[PDB]
Design a protein around this ligand. Structure first.
Ligand SMILES: [Cl-]
Ligand SMILES: [Mg+2]
Ligand SMILES: [Mg+2]
Ligand SMILES: [Mg+2]
Ligand SMILES: [Mg+2]
Lengths: 111, 235, 241, 244, 250, 231, 240, 243, 204
């Protein structure tokens, strides 16, 4: 039977300061006991001073980030280059994730 | 006969131009934008004295920060208002924020040209969409059935529009207060209306950042009418 | 007067669009003829290549619908090819569904029913073509069935189509009045083709070179067209007697 | 495109009338007269066949009177082919109701729906309306004996006595004159035939030019019987009433 | 593309006339004469084989058609319209009846189905009415022998005898004088041939006349033996020779 | 005359009048100018107002980081076509990780407009577009007509009185093409070009609209006091 | 599907199909609505061209949409059935989803929206019907009376009439109905409604229908004799 | 009358006037030609330089279908592009199912049927282009020309547009003077000449020459544009002949 | 779980001399629980009788369905449907639900009004016809009924004798079945008279 999910490992960490924020993540990509890459970026600059990382199943993580970056692009087109606030980005991401409630993105996401 | 989406030799859509004639027959609606808020006012124009005038709803809330006045075939506006309200609330669902007045107006105007042989004809109503947001502040837009929308400092639509617009040309300046704008709408409405203006056959409204969109009571408007009469008699 | 633009009845009970489609049939100014032998069915048609820039090999109004069925068309080539493609598709589908080769008369009926629909349904126009189907049927033997824009079809002993159809028709009528049989009593198809060409020459009153004619022959289990050199051999035999 | 050839069957005239409905009514006015009369103990349905021939097989013929179910029947005036389309819909309908509620369909409910179907053809679809007017004769346990009529507009009304088709103006006057509320079926039979005999365009009213039917509680005890009259039975009732 | 003619092409005129139906009836009037006569023990239907060309094999064109083993049909008007109606009539006899009840439909109900098809072409979008009048003769167990006419409007009437097409007015008068309720099938065939001779100009023989009957069961035409209840079709098309034999005693 | 009722009808001389009437809507529209060098491509647009209380209708729309256009005619039709371009530019990026070629963008607009000229029921687009962009083969300028015709040019202008600006560019061809690595001078040439189409009115701060794209320059629009430099 | 645009604008900015639908309403029998202090009365004309009618089974002019709301109309009868059916379905749908009966204003807004939809949808013509919708909101004693028309506009009325000769009865109501003091009782409200119809009706026999609607789903239709008593009293006072 | 107002309506002649009006749009367009040579085909087209502002060699008119078929057309350019888009879909589905690249005669019918389909209904307009196309397949070289009616034939030489008569006359001379045949490189030279000679009918504005070719020997049976030195050599040959 | 044995019940039909008989039990249950002792499983459409065993909702549903179809048949044909024709209609109607069948065991019984010939037939749940000369059985005690019918039955029985035979077949089969009983009914059918008799049996 075909299993559409996988586990690419990795770990991410977000800490919020008083006037700054960090989003860290290891660069290792794996399947089972093998290493795929020792340097495969996992945390991305998505625009509007927002950084994002979707950790777990890399194929679903790459798809979500790709879709959010796209959501930012169209937010500018549709709303006069308005800056997407972090709280608005979070709510948008909820709707990206729940749009596949019955075939989920197998990722834990942090922005 | 002929197509509904047909161009005239001058390069205009027949049906869009004909819908503009229907809007000219409609009751007058006026909007004035200031730095203290945007004021919206309308002529109710009851067809009979037995008609309970308070049921005439030509000024309408879209969201807490966006209001709307209409002129023309007012029945056509209901689905536009419904779409506007849905768009405003849906954006709040997706983005956890108020929607820009321009974006809301654009969403309404996207419906305009969705007609052919979709709906069977253009809308026969013009809208004055007034509101406030953090980016562009207090705004007033004029949404037509052509799908075009212009931003205005002040605007009049309906039967007494060109007479009222000429009056708004002279009276408007960038330092207008809200109270001054209220009286100015009442003044111009009284000028273009057939019947004598009072609190029952005319309605005021405004949108401020603090209190949001509010339709004025007949008691509140009555005082502004009495305040107008005295200041005109003062010179 | 919109009753003349679409296929609805006029006050006289007529369909003018169907009648005008019949007139488009002769637009090519080509005459065709079909006859039956003992073992074969022959069809001949005039070939006219007016432009020197044309590739004469591609100029044809005879079509190989299936291995057994051949079709000659009288009318403009676009409608002719439209009908040809449809007939080919129908013949193939028939074999797949019913497990045997589509008969000539059954295909004719099917195409005639399609033509009928265009005379009844408004959005579809009639095809301005007359379709003459030929084969050697395994049950009925040598067969000629012809369809027109009205949706009419019928079997034939022999037939002719085009601007000068009447002259050819009467010529054939007079021959069968003498012989008192429904076919050309001849063993080889070569001589049946010679008969067809000879009687077209007599009827039209024109001589033919190898490039002036186009010939189709139906035998048991195959239909085929003749090349220019095959026709030349046919013309030589006619002249030598 | 196709717009060029569209007659636009579902539009108002400047006077606020539906062109096709009015023209359909004009068609129906040339159809054979049909009469319905409601009595205290039953209902009569009488109708005139249009210029028949001697070679027409009458005993197996049916152009006017149709059976919808055991309790309800209809008299037709207009295009017969159009009427049969509607009749079969009404029959299916009475059966749907019976399957759902396990009770015979009330007369008005059946009438309302046929009338709603007719209405639909006047408001949407771009098709011509049905050129048919019905007289519904039926019985149920709520309102008892009932007469209704429907026309191409899809409007329906209830009646004590009514005519459709040709010469309804003359026929309705004659019915309005001689009709009384305490009337019985046998009297209503006589009225229906006398009215046709005076309004007919034919030289004389004969058995071969008529279709006739009754709905009676004249069935053994509390129940209702439909009687579609045979040619010989129409001939007898014509002699009995003193017309031939 | 798409069929954008979703509106009626037949509409009521101010006078109440349905123009396209009237015009269809005019097309039927121009058509070749056909007739039907009902006897006590059978029905006969007949028409002229109007051959378009002497080179054409008129045997291949069948104006009289079998719809079911006990029901036959003949027409006047547009031939192609008739051909497709026969195809639909044959199919509807199976789909709306035989596949449900396991037996062929009675004449009146098959006629009803054909009538429905013709009515729909009078009201549906983007179509014209059929330009034919049908005469349908048939037999069934509970109704016996019957003969029906079906017009372009979809209206149908049962007849003792009738005629349609070119010389129908004269032919119907001729049939009124000759018809009675005690006619045997052979007498009806004889009357049919007499009536049909009046409307024919040219050759009058078995090769130019098409005639069929609904009569006794034909076990010889069934194609198999072994089932007593299956006794064969009542529809039979008369041969060219069988017609000529009755033309000598004419 | 009898052949202008719909887009599906040729006239006896082989003309499509509904398309020609749609072309007429462009001529009524306000003037806009397009021109390019080897390094940069510039759009200059004269915005139009309803009256003194009204705003000046926006003429320039961004399609991607490397592409955008200016409009003349029915603005809603420009919104539809620009939205289509946005989607196509975006499809190219998401699927092929490839910036859409300006030439291919023109081919897509041509094909979209064409479908509206051959089918019954619909109508032609009532707007003309000037597309600029910088891709792998350098700077580009395209002119779109709603007939479907798309043309790659060094410079052009569309709208009312556009013939004046088009003549100027035809004279200046050899000069402005050489303006490489100098955005301000290329805009100056565009502002001077659009000035040849002006009558009565002149270029004010809220009247003028400029856009630019180039080698190391994303598509950006300049309005308000940002164009006061060029007045 | 049939998509043809039947309702379209004309050069002078009119939608003729909607305006011709109003002409159908003008042809229809007169209907009147009057609201008192604690009730609403709906009066309807019955044309006496149709006698030999069975009044038991003939569709009544006033239709209950729910137990607390009624709807009368003027114009095409067949068209009105479609609106009434839709209104009745929506009334049950509202109870089913929101657990409250519709307000009179809501029901009117729905019906008016349906009418409007038929003025800019392809392949359909406008309803040749104007309605008077009356009733009392749940747990409310304030009378409600609304009017709709083919275009889709709606509004509330102290008193209103529609149909043929509505101009005359509206004239009567405008001078007789006082807003400061409306019909205090049911009698006064019915009397004024009958009086208004007597300006137009012809005979006061079986030509006048009256339906009284009171708060808390109390709806009743008056009989011929009850109405005839009002007709008698009115004319006896008039002889002076 | 009124028979010319709607497509797919037969006149009393038996003609479809709407298709004949589409031909007028073709006759209004620029000149385009096709020449069949020994082992392939050559296509050439006249591009009118409306203005100096037109970028040279950028507005390409000739289009490739698959990798072995070339298409050129005169008339409404968008209509031609639409037809080629369909041609590419037809060629793709043929190769998808049958593996081999679509033969030219097979391809010719695919366009023919599609164009003919636009003469069957009043809901569509006929194509406003005559299309010259062809290439090399397993059976050798083929040249075709396709009219608005859906009519097409095979050709030794083909021409359409405003200068078609002038072109046709020149093509007829080549057929007579070269019965044994014409080489691919010769055909390119002759193609240039014919476009230059046909330009006398569009002599107001100056023009740009565009040539393409498929040849078994010269291009390995693939469609390619004539560029650089070979194009300039053809232009020089053409300019020498007019003087 | 087995739909054909949730509600329980039996039907049996027999031919005689110029007559037919059809009988059924009256039980309706929910497995072990007895719910009704008045659930008759025999219906008639004119002079054609139909007995149905199996799932009670489908029994009720099919009755309403065949009532629907026979009423329309009669309106169009202008005559009552005959057993041979009805049998084909039942088969047709069951097979149209081939892959979502009604869980029933129908039994047709009647006399052709024209030929006078007695007729019975049985079906499986999806339409296969069993046209028998002697007898037809259906239900949860079908095995028991087969044993009784096959031993007690003899051809050309008179109505009053046939009654005793079919009654004893039913009663003794029902008393060896837990899911059948709680009363019984027997229809005796002749060309123009039909008698219906309720039998006295053990109520456990
Ligand atoms: Cl077929
Ligand atoms: Mg047609
Ligand atoms: Mg018909
Ligand atoms: Mg037991
Ligand atoms: Mg027990």
């Amino acid at each position: 039977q075909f299993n559409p999910y996988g586990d690419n490992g990795g770990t991410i960490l977000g800490i919020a300061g008083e006037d700054f924020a960090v989003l860290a993540g290891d660069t290792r990509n794996i399947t089972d006991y093998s290493i795929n890459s020792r340097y495969e970026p996992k945390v991305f600059d998505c625009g509007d001073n927002i950084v994002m990382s979707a950790n777990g199943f890399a194929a679903d993580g790459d798809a979500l980030v790709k879709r959010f970056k796209n959501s930012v692009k169209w937010y500018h087109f549709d709303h006069n280059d308005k800056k997407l606030s972090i709280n608005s980005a979070a709510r948008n991401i909820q709707h990206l994730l729940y749009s596949r409630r019955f075939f989920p993105y197998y990722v834990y996401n942090i922005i | 006969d002929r197509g509904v989406s047909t161009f005239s030799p001058e390069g205009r859509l027949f049906q869009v131009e004909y819908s503009l004639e229907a809007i000219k027959l409609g009751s007058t609606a006026i909007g004035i934008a200031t730095k203290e808020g945007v004021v919206l006012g309308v002529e109710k124009r009851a067809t009979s004295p037995l008609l309970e005038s308070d049921s005439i709803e030509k000024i309408v809330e879209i969201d807490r920060h966006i209001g709307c006045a209409m002129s023309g075939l007012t029945a056509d506006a209901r689905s536009m208002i419904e779409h506007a309200r849905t768009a405003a609330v849906t954006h709040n669902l997706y983005y956890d924020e108020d929607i820009n007045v321009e974006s809301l107006t654009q969403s309404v105007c996207d419906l305009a040209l969705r007609f052919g042989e979709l709906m069977s004809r253009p809308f026969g109503v013009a809208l004055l969409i007034a509101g406030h947001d953090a980016d562009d502040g207090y705004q007033l837009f004029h949404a037509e059935p052509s799908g075009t929308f212009y931003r205005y400092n002040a605007k009049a639509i309906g039967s007494g529009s060109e007479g009222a617009q000429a009056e708004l040309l002279n009276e408007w300046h960038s330092s207008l207060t809200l109270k001054e704008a209220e009286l100015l709408v009442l003044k111009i409405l009284k000028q273009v209306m057939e019947e004598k203006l009072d609190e029952n056959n005319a309605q005021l409204s405004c949108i401020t950042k603090q209190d949001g969109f509010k339709i004025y009571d007949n008691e509140k408007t009555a005082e502004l009418i009495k305040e107008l009469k005295e200041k005109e008699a003062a010179e | 007067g919109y009753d003349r633009h679409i296929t609805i009845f006029s006050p006289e009970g007529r369909l003018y669009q169907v009648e005008y489609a019949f007139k488009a049939t002769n637009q090519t100014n080509i005459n065709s003829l079909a006859v039956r032998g003992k073992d074969c069915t022959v069809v001949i048609s005039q070939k006219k290549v007016p432009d020197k820039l044309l590739d004469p090999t591609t100029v044809s109004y005879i079509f190989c619908i299936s291995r057994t069925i051949g079709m000659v068309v009288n009318g403009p080539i676009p409608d002719a090819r439209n009908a040809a493609l449809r007939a080919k598709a129908e013949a193939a589908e028939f074999r797949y569904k019913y497990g045997y080769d589509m008969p000539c008369d059954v295909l004719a009926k099917r195409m005639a029913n399609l033509s009928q629909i265009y005379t009844q349904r408004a959005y579809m126009r009639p095809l301005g073509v007359i379709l003459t189907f030929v084969s050697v049927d395994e049950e009925l033997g040598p067969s000629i069935y012809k369809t027109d824009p009205a949706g009419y079809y019928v079997g034939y002993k022999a037939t002719a189509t085009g601007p000068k159809q009447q002259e050819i028709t009467t010529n054939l009528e007079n021959h069968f009045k003498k012989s008192k049989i429904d076919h050309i009593n001849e063993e080889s198809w070569e001589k049946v083709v010679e008969f067809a060409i000879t009687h077209m020459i007599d009827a039209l009153g024109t001589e033919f070179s190898k490039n002036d004619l186009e010939v189709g022959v139906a035998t048991k289990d195959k239909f085929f067209t003749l090349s220019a050199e095959n026709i030349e051999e046919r013309l030589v035999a006619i002249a030598e007697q | 495109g196709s717009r060029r050839y569209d007659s636009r069957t579902t539009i108002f005239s400047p006077e606020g009338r539906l062109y096709q409905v009015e023209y359909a009514l004009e068609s129906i006015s040339h159809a054979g007269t049909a009469i319905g009369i409601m009595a205290s103990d039953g209902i009569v349905l009488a109708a005139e066949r249009k210029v028949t021939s001697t070679l027409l097989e009458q005993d197996t013929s049916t152009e006017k009177l149709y059976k919808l179910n055991d309790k309800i029947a209809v008299a037709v005036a207009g295009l017969t082919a159009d009427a049969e389309i509607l009749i079969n819909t009404a029959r299916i309908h009475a059966q749907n109701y019976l399957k759902t509620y396990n009770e015979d369909i009330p007369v008005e409910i059946l009438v309302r729906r046929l009338s709603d179907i007719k209405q639909g053809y006047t408001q949407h679809g771009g098709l011509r309306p049905f050129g048919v007017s019905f007289i519904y004769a039926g019985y149920d346990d709520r309102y008892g004996y009932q007469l209704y009529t429907s026309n191409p507009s899809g409007n329906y009304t209830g009646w004590k006595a009514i005519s459709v088709g040709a010469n309804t103006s003359a026929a309705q006057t004659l019915l309005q004159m001689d009709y009384k509320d305490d009337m019985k079926v046998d009297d209503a039979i006589e009225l229906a035939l006398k009215t046709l005999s005076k309004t007919t365009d034919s030289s004389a009213l004969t058995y071969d030019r008529l279709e006739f039917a009754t709905i009676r509680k004249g069935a053994n005890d509390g129940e209702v019987y439909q009687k579609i009259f045979k040619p010989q039975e129409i001939k007898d009732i014509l002699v009995k009433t003193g017309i031939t | 593309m798409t069929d954008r003619y979703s509106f009626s092409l037949t509409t009521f005129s101010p006078s109440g006339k349905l123009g396209q139906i009237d015009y269809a009836l005019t097309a039927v009037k121009q058509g070749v004469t056909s007739l039907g006569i009902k006897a006590t023990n059978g029905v006969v239907i007949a028409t002229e084989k109007k051959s378009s060309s002497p080179l054409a094999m008129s045997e291949t064109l069948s104006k009289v058609s079998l719809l079911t083993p006990d029901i036959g049909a003949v027409y006047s008007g547009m031939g192609p319209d008739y051909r497709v109606l026969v195809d639909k009539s044959r199919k509807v006899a199976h789909t709306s009846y035989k596949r449900i009840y396991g037996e062929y439909p009675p004449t009146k109900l098959l006629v009803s189905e054909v009538a429905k098809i013709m009515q729909e072409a009078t009201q549906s979008g983007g179509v014209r009415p059929f330009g034919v009048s049908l005469l349908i003769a048939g037999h069934d167990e509970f109704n016996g022998f019957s003969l029906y006419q079906v017009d372009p409007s979809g209206s149908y009437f049962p007849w003792k005898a009738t005629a349609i097409g070119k010389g129908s007015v004269a032919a119907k008068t001729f049939l009124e004088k000759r018809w009675n309720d005690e006619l045997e099938l052979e007498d009806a065939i004889h009357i049919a041939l007499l009536t049909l001779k009046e409307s024919v100009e040219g050759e009058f023989n078995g090769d130019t006349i098409e005639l069929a009957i609904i009569g006794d069961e034909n076990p010889d035409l069934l194609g198999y033996t072994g089932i007593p209840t299956d006794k064969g079709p009542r529809f039979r098309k008369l041969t060219s020779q069988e017609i000529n034999d009755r033309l000598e005693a004419l | 005359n009898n052949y202008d009722g719909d887009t599906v009808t040729f006239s006896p001389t082989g003309r499509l009048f509904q398309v020609e009437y749609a072309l007429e809507a462009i001529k009524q529209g306000s003037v806009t100018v397009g021109l390019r060098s080897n390094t940069h491509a510039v759009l200059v647009a004269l915005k139009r107002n309803a009256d003194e209380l009204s705003s000046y209708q926006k003429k320039i729309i961004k399609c991607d980081e490397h592409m955008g256009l200016s409009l003349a005619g029915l603005a809603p039709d420009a919104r539809v076509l620009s939205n289509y371009l946005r989607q196509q530019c975006n499809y190219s990026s998401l699927v092929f990780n490839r910036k859409l070629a300006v030439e291919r963008a023109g081919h897509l607009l041509c094909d979209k407009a064409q479908k509206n000229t051959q089918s019954y029921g619909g109508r032609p687009y009532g707007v003309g577009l000037l597309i600029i962009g910088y891709d792998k083969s350098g700077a580009h300028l395209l002119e779109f007509q709603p007939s479907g015709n798309v043309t790659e040019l060094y410079g052009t202008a569309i709208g009312a009185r556009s013939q004046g600006a088009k003549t100027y560019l035809e004279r200046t061809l050899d000069t402005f093409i050489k303006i490489d690595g100098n955005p301000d001078e290329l805009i100056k040439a565009g502002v001077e070009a659009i000035s040849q189409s002006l009558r009565d009115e002149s270029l004010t701060v809220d009247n003028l609209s400029i856009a630019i794209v180039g080698k190391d320059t994303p598509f950006t629009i300049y309005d308000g006091e940002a164009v006061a430099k060029y007045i | 599907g049939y998509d043809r645009a039947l309702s379209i604008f004309s050069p002078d900015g009119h939608i003729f199909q909607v305006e011709y639908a109003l002409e159908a309403v003008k042809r229809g029998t007169c209907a009147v609505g009057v609201k008192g202090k604690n009730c609403v009365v709906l009066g309807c004309e019955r044309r006496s061209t149709l006698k030999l009618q069975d009044t038991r089974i003939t569709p009544s002019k006033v239709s209950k949409i729910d137990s607390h709301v009624v709807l009368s109309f003027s114009g095409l009868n067949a068209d009105s059935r479609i609106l009434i059916e839709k209104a009745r379905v929506e009334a049950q749908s509202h109870r089913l989803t929101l657990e409250d009966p519709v307000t009179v204003e809501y029901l009117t807004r729905y019906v008016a929206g349906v009418q409007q939809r038929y003025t800019q949808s392809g392949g359909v013509r406008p309803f040749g019907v104007s309605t008077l919708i009356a009733g009392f909101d749940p747990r409310d004693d304030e009378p409600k009376l609304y009017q709709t028309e083919p275009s889709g506009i709606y509004s509330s009325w102290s008193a209103q009439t529609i149909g043929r000769n509505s101009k005359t009865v509206r004239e009567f109501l405008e001078k007789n109905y006082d807003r400061k003091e409306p019909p205090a009782t049911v009698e006064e409200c019915v009397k004024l409604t009958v009086r208004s119809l007597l300006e137009v009706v012809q005979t006061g026999a079986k030509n006048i229908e009256i339906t009284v609607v009171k708060p808390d789903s109390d709806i009743v239709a008056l009989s011929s004799e009850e109405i005839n008593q009002y007709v008698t009293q009115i004319e006896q006072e008039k002889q002076e | 009358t009124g028979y010319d107002l709607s497509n797919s309506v037969f006149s009393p002649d038996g003609r479809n006037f709407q298709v004949e009006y589409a031909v007028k749009a073709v006759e209004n367009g620029t000149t385009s030609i096709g020449i069949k040579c020994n082992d392939g085909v050559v296509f050439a087209v006249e591009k009118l330089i409306t203005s100096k502002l037109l970028v040279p060699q950028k507005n390409v008119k000739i289009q490739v279908v698959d990798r072995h078929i070339g298409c050129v057309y005169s008339g409404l350019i968008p209509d031609g592009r639409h037809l080629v888009n369909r041609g590419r879909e037809e060629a793709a589905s043929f190769k998808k199912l049958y593996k081999t690249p679509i033969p030219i005669p097979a391809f010719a019918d695919r366009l023919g049927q599609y164009v003919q389909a636009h003469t069957l209904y009043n809901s569509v307009r006929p194509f406003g282009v005559s299309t010259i196309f062809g290439g090399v397949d397993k059976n050798g070289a083929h040249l075709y020309m396709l009219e608005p009616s859906g009519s097409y034939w095979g050709y030794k030489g083909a021409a359409t547009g405003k200068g078609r008569q002038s072109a046709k006359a020149e093509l007829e001379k080549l057929v007579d003077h070269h019965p044994e045949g014409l080489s691919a490189r010769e055909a390119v030279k002759q193609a240039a000449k014919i476009i230059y000679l046909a330009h006398e009918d569009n002599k107001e504005k100056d023009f740009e020459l565009e040539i393409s070719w498929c040849s078994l020997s010269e291009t390995n049976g693939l469609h390619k544009f004539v560029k650089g030195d070979l194009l300039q050599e053809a232009i020089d040959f053409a300019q020498k002949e007019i003087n | 779980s087995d739909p054909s044995s949730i509600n329980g019940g039996i039907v049996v039909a027999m031919t005689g001399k110029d007559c037919v008989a059809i009988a059924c039990d009256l039980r309706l249950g929910s497995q072990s629980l007895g719910v009704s002792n008045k659930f008759e499983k025999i219906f008639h459409y004119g002079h054609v009788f139909l007995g149905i065993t199996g799932l009670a909702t489908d029994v009720t549903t099919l009755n309403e369905m065949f009532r629907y179809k026979t009423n329309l048949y009669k309106l169009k044909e202008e005559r009552a449907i005959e057993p041979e024709t009805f049998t084909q209609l039942v088969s047709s109607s069951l097979y149209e639900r081939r892959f979502g069948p009604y869980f029933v065991g129908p039994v047709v019984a009647g006399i052709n009004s024209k030929s006078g010939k007695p007729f019975i037939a049985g079906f499986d749940l999806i339409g296969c016809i069993d046209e028998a000369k002697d007898f037809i059985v259906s239900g949860t005690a079908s095995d028991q009924l087969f044993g009784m019918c096959e031993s007690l039955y003899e051809p050309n029985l008179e109505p009053e004798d046939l009654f005793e035979t079919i009654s004893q077949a039913l009663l003794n089969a029902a008393d060896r079945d837990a899911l059948s009983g709680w009363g019984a009914v027997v229809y005796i059918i002749k060309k123009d008279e039909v008698v219906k008799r309720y039998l006295k049996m053990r109520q456990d």
